[PDB]
Design an enzyme around this catalytic site. Sequence first.
Site, PDB file in Angstrom:
ATOM      1  N   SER A  85     -60.328   4.803 -35.717  1.00  0.00           N
ATOM      2  CA  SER A  85     -59.340   3.731 -35.677  1.00  0.00           C
ATOM      3  C   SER A  85     -57.902   4.258 -35.544  1.00  0.00           C
ATOM      4  O   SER A  85     -57.623   4.980 -34.586  1.00  0.00           O
ATOM      5  CB  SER A  85     -59.514   2.841 -36.896  1.00  0.00           C
ATOM      6  OG  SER A  85     -58.846   3.349 -38.034  1.00  0.00           O
ATOM      7  N   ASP A 116     -65.337  -5.403 -33.215  1.00  0.00           N
ATOM      8  CA  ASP A 116     -66.188  -4.722 -34.180  1.00  0.00           C
ATOM      9  C   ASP A 116     -65.849  -5.170 -35.595  1.00  0.00           C
ATOM     10  O   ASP A 116     -66.200  -4.501 -36.561  1.00  0.00           O
ATOM     11  CB  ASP A 116     -66.064  -3.192 -34.034  1.00  0.00           C
ATOM     12  CG  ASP A 116     -64.734  -2.631 -34.561  1.00  0.00           C
ATOM     13  OD1 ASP A 116     -63.820  -3.390 -34.922  1.00  0.00           O
ATOM     14  OD2 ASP A 116     -64.601  -1.400 -34.598  1.00  0.00           O
ATOM     15  N   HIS A 119     -66.835  -1.696 -37.419  1.00  0.00           N
ATOM     16  CA  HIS A 119     -65.736  -0.792 -37.747  1.00  0.00           C
ATOM     17  C   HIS A 119     -66.007   0.155 -38.913  1.00  0.00           C
ATOM     18  O   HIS A 119     -65.588   1.313 -38.880  1.00  0.00           O
ATOM     19  CB  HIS A 119     -64.493  -1.604 -38.070  1.00  0.00           C
ATOM     20  CG  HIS A 119     -63.217  -0.895 -37.760  1.00  0.00           C
ATOM     21  ND1 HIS A 119     -62.855  -0.555 -36.476  1.00  0.00           N
ATOM     22  CD2 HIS A 119     -62.215  -0.468 -38.561  1.00  0.00           C
ATOM     23  CE1 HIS A 119     -61.677   0.045 -36.499  1.00  0.00           C
ATOM     24  NE2 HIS A 119     -61.271   0.113 -37.753  1.00  0.00           N
ATOM     25  N   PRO A 176     -73.359   0.041 -44.781  1.00  0.00           N
ATOM     26  CA  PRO A 176     -74.683   0.511 -44.362  1.00  0.00           C
ATOM     27  C   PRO A 176     -75.117  -0.104 -43.025  1.00  0.00           C
ATOM     28  O   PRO A 176     -74.637  -1.172 -42.655  1.00  0.00           O
ATOM     29  CB  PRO A 176     -75.598   0.045 -45.507  1.00  0.00           C
ATOM     30  CG  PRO A 176     -74.929  -1.194 -46.019  1.00  0.00           C
ATOM     31  CD  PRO A 176     -73.441  -0.930 -45.891  1.00  0.00           C
TER      32      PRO A 176
HETATM   33 CA   LIG Z   1     -73.818  -3.495 -42.046  1.00  0.00          CA
END
Ligand SMILES: [Ca+2]
Length: 387
Positions: free
Chosen positions: A112, A316, A357, A365
């Site tokens: 990022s 995202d 992201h 996860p």
């Molecule tokens: Ca996830």
Amino acid sequence: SPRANDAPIVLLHGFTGWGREEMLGFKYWGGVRGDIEQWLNDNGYRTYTLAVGPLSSNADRACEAYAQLVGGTVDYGAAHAAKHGHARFGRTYPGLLPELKRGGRVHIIAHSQGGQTARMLVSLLENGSQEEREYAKAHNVSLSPLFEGGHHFVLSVTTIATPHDGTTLVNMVDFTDRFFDLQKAVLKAAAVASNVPYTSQVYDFKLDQWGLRRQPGESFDHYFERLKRSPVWTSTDTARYDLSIPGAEKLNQWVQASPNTYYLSFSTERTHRGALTGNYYPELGMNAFSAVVCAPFLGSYRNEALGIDDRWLENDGIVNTVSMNGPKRGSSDRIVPYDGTLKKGVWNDMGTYNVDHLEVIGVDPNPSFDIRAFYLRLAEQLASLRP
Ligand SMILES: [Ca+2]
Ligand SMILES: [Zn+2]
């Protein structure tokens, strides 16, 4: 793809990102999935982690990165410091990789905002800063070698989910600001935290240059009046400005791809398109904060005037996907789709991955995403680069 260099790797976090000594050992690079730096080191790739201002401008973060790499006291530049009204000098580091002063090279892997920071570091290393050079000579003050130009020690920059063109999430914040100024709230929180014992062991805001802490002899009255006069509250010298659509373009106008450096971009999406509106919606599995707070805006906000069209809606959860393949707004950089051979001086678009992201760095996860393989494959490509 045989190994053609043994240059070390450094990891460079984005916005809000924290170092390995922070957050009780919960890693930015790996999160709940494990320790990415250790995976790389275990597999024969010398890897270190940088920790720069989580909320600071890319300029400030670039100077911090430089100091952490080669050693020394952070120097934001006399001209920059005077212009924005914060301290010129910052923290002192012994140096992670002084070999870079003696012909060594390094690969930077960034997530990022870190991608903006890495681009800027390379630009400053290569070209220095004309404004800082002229200011130093005009006023007869010292000059950081970072602003000299002629330094070439970055062999590659890899960006992951980087808002090279900005993210329209800042536009949502512009709206929310009318009732709840998020920048001011965060800064006030950091000012309070700066006076509280131990808190920086958990999360270090790294805002020393603004002097938010009460100084040793200082009365609360003096302190409060001093804080009221700080330019930090409304400064554009922040991550927020550089991450915005106008600020990212401003960055793009001077921070260009060096012909001596390989650039790789990875893009991310975790959304699906509505058949009627063309709006994008968060997939099930996207981290909850992004799914509720950010994704709905990101996937529907348009501004045809600014050129924010339907191509900006895929995201995202934090950054618009179209922003990630490389700088475009205000940029002359070339971006090419990966074709099996990595090219110097251009953005090698390594494709778009169905990961959000936070999942891409393991903070959230996602069992479908083989994060180990992702980073090991990336390391192998970087080791394949011909100096
Ligand atoms: Ca996830
Ligand atoms: Zn600054």
